[PDB]
Amino acid sequence: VDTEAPQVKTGDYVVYRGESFEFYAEITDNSGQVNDVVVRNVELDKKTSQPYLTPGFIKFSTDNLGLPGNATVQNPLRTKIFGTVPLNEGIGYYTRYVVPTDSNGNTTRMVQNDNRNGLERFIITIKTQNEKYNPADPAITYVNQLSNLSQAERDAVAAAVRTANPQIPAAARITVSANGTVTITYPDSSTDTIPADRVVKDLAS
Ligand SMILES: [Ca+2]
Ligand SMILES: [Co+2]
């Protein structure tokens, strides 16, 4: 009789506010068949005494559930853990559980122990949006006075930064100070800076 639960491999997951993500847990069972997979908090929801998963932005799906041979060591079952992080999501980390059930009623046991991290237990770390990008230097804007850029010069720098950084979000804001220092404000309000020496130079005749 099958008394062995499915085994799971996950990882150490990093996600970023305002950005989408997807990870795949790998699941196998000695019987070769997994009937269900739930990604969940270890504790039940106070409001329903039923399983749940917080933060609410974490979603999951598993194709090919309940079919013979869907979870063998050779061809594992894969559970996708995906979503988009809200711009105001709390910065920090969580440990959550991938909990499959095989064809014989055996369910992987949730065990709160760091030695299970990366197996059925996984860490997900939520970082600010600026941590996903590394702003590129723009083409130099040449200005009449390095201590006092005009509005049009500040406007040209921002356009140059935008041109040099197509990979940053369209909703990221580029502001330029009076000495040409660039601030990039991402949609989640975190920031990056490009120092003036890589942005502006004095205009020669
Ligand atoms: Ca089994
Ligand atoms: Co001059």
Residue numbers in the entry: 256 to 460
Quote the study's own text.
Many streptococci adhere to protein-attached carbohydrates expressed on cell surfaces using Siglec-like binding regions (SLBRs). Siglec-like binding regions (SLBRs) are among the streptococcal adhesive modules that bind sialoglycans. SLBRs contain two adjacent modules: a Siglec domain, which shares some features with mammalian Siglecs, and a Unique domain13 with no close homologs outside of the family. The conserved sialic acid-recognition motif governs general specificity while sequence diversity in surrounding loop regions allows the SLBR to select between related sialoglycans.
To understand selectivity of these SLBRs for human glycans, we chose comparators from each branch for detailed study. From the first branch of the tree (blue in Fig. 2), we selected the SLBRs of the Hsa adhesin from S. gordonii strain Challis (termed SLBRHsa) and the equivalent SLBRs from Streptococcus sanguinis strain SK678 (SLBRSK678) and Streptococcus gordonii strain UB10712 (SLBRUB10712; see footnote). Although these three SLBRs are >80% identical in amino acid sequence, when they were tested with arrays containing 49 sialoglycans, they exhibited distinct binding profiles. In comparison, SLBRUB10712 and SLBRSK678 were more narrowly selective, although both bound to multiple sialoglycan ligands. Specifically, SLBRUB10712 bound strongly to 3’-sialyl-N-acetyllactosamine (3’sLn; Neu5Acα2-3Galβ1-4GlcNAcβ, Fig. 1b) and a small range of related structures, while SLBRSK678 bound to only two of the glycans on this array, 3’sLn and 6-O-sulfo-sialyl Lewis X (6S-sLeX; Neu5Acα2-3Galβ1-4(Fucα1-3)GlcNAc6Sβ, Fig. 1c). To reveal how similar SLBRs could include or exclude different sialoglycans, we determined crystal structures of these five SLBRs at resolutions between 1.0 Å and 1.7 Å. We then evaluated selectivity conferred by the FG loop where crystallographic analysis would suggest that the β-branching of SLBRHsaD356 excludes C3 fucosylation, while the larger, unbranched Gln of SLBRUB10712 and SLBRSK678 can bind fucosylated ligands. All three of these variants exhibited a substantial increase in binding for 6S-sLeX.
